UniProtKB/Swiss-Prot annotation, chain A:
Illness association: Microcephaly and chorioretinopathy, autosomal recessive, 1: A syndrome characterized by microcephaly, cognitive impairment, underdeveloped retina and choroid, and epilepsy in some patients. The more anterior parts of the retina, near the periphery and pars plana, have a grayish hue and diminutive vasculature similar to retinopathy of prematurity. Visual impairment becomes evident during the first year of life.
Lineage: superkingdom: Eukaryota
Organism ancestry: Eukaryota, Metazoa, Chordata, Craniata, Vertebrata
Record's subunit section: Component of the gamma-tubulin ring complex (gTuRC) consisting of TUBGCP2, TUBGCP3, TUBGCP4, TUBGCP5 and TUBGCP6 and gamma-tubulin TUBG1 or TUBG2. TUBGCP2, TUBGCP3, TUBGCP4, TUBGCP5 and TUBGCP6 assemble in a 5:5:2:1:1 stoichiometry; each is associated with a gamma-tubulin, thereby arranging 14 gamma-tubulins in a helical manner. Gamma-tubulin at the first position is blocked by TUBGCP3 at the last position, allowing 13 protafilaments to grow into a microtubule.
Gene of this entry: TUBGCP6
Protein name as annotated: Gamma-tubulin complex component 6
Compartments in which it is found: Cytoplasm, Cytoskeleton, Microtubule organizing center, Centrosome
Role description: Component of the gamma-tubulin ring complex (gTuRC) which mediates microtubule nucleation. The gTuRC regulates the minus-end nucleation of alpha-beta tubulin heterodimers that grow into microtubule protafilaments, a critical step in centrosome duplication and spindle formation.
Similarity comment: family membership: Belongs to the TUBGCP family.
Protein's organism: Homo sapiens (Human)
Curated annotation (Swiss-Prot), chain B:
Oligomeric form and interacting partners: Component of the gamma-tubulin ring complex (gTuRC) consisting of TUBGCP2, TUBGCP3, TUBGCP4, TUBGCP5 and TUBGCP6 and gamma-tubulin TUBG1 or TUBG2. TUBGCP2, TUBGCP3, TUBGCP4, TUBGCP5 and TUBGCP6 assemble in a 5:5:2:1:1 stoichiometry; each is associated with a gamma-tubulin, thereby arranging 14 gamma-tubulins in a helical manner. Gamma-tubulin at the first position is blocked by TUBGCP3 at the last position, allowing 13 protafilaments to grow into a microtubule.
Family: Belongs to the TUBGCP family.
Gene name in the database record: TUBGCP2
Role played: Component of the gamma-tubulin ring complex (gTuRC) which mediates microtubule nucleation. The gTuRC regulates the minus-end nucleation of alpha-beta tubulin heterodimers that grow into microtubule protafilaments, a critical step in centrosome duplication and spindle formation. Plays a role in neuronal migration.
Residues of the full protein shown: 302 to 451 of 902
Tissue expression pattern: Ubiquitously expressed.
Entry protein name: Gamma-tubulin complex component 2
Length: 163, 137
């Protein structure tokens, strides 16, 4: 939620950048027409947030379903640039069981928390890789004691799972 | 580099091209950089850091800005420069046994049958060598 909150301010400043830039003193009617194709988009961002609100994976997936729901329209880049940075910290967690194996948790945003030794309870993104990540980590933790095409994630990932 | 950004304005103002409303735009980056250096110079004054603890702070004040990219390319220039002198004695303690450290700041201090000669000091650990605080000694 912080990153998504940190991604939003990366946008408002642009909205503050566009204003106070072009018009020194223009016609009154020019203001209403100029800020129409952009103003209505600002009111759309109120439907997205509250002005409750999910957190963790529940939010990283809720924002995803807002893409396909309104894909081809002019709201594709702005939502994408949010999702592209609202998932930045979550990849790092995923970037643990794949490279280092040191599970990192703070408040439970991860879908997975922590003789038999296999009691790391587990139970949107393609489930074809969901269950695989759960086992791709426990192996490392065991050796230590001895269009929406998601290709930018699985491609640098599946190459390391088989090895 | 801030004494130049005020030199370019004292020359561009002679020609009359610098209205007050125009100033409030040009200094926007120099108002954000001088607001990081005035926050590290505050923690150091308030909390006595010298040696390692003044290098732990510059590894946490650089992780808190893990999404700014305009105040992380800065705090990564300070840490990368305020740690060469600390890392030039470390290259004398790993590749050889001599510890110069005139000011008592290094993580390892010697003494005058061998578990008391060299002792790890707990304060002066950079908190990014904490994982290998033992293999160094």
């Amino acid at each position: 939620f912080q990153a998504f909150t940190s991604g939003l301010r990366r946008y408002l400043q642009y909205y503050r950048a566009c204003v106070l830039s072009t018009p020194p003193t223009l016609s009154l009617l020019t203001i209403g027409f100029l800020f129409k194709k952009l103003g209505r988009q600002l009111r759309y961002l109120a439907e997205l947030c509250g002005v409750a609100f999910p957190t963790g994976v529940k939010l990283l997936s809720y924002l995803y379903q807002e893409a396909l729901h309104n894909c081809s329209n002019e709201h594709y880049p702005v939502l994408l640039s949010l999702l592209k940075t609202s998932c930045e910290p979550y990849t790092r967690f995923i970037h643990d069981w794949v490279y280092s194996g040191v599970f990192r948790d703070a408040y439970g945003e991860f879908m997975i928390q922590v003789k038999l030794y296999w009691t790391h309870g587990y139970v949107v993104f393609l489930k074809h890789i969901a269950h695989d990540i759960y086992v791709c980590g426990k192996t490392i933790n065991l050796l230590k004691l001895c269009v929406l095409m998601k290709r930018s994630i699985t491609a640098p990932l599946a190459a390391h799972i088989s090895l | 580099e801030h004494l130049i950004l005020v030199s370019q304005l004292e020359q561009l103002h002679r020609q009359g091209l610098l209205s007050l409303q125009k100033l409030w735009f040009y200094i926007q980056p120099a108002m954000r950089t001088m607001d990081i250096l005035a926050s590290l110079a505050t923690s150091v004054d308030k909390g006595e850091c010298l040696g390692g603890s003044t290098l732990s702070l510059l590894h946490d004040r650089s992780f808190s800005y893990t999404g700014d990219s305009q105040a992380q390319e800065l705090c990564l220039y300070l840490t990368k420069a305020a740690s060469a002198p600390y890392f030039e004695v470390l290259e004398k303690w790993i590749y050889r046994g001599i510890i110069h450290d005139p000011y008592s700041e290094f993580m390892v201090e010697e003494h005058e049958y061998w578990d008391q000669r060299y002792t790890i000091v707990q304060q002066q650990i950079p908190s990014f060598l904490q994982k290998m605080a033992d293999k160094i000694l």
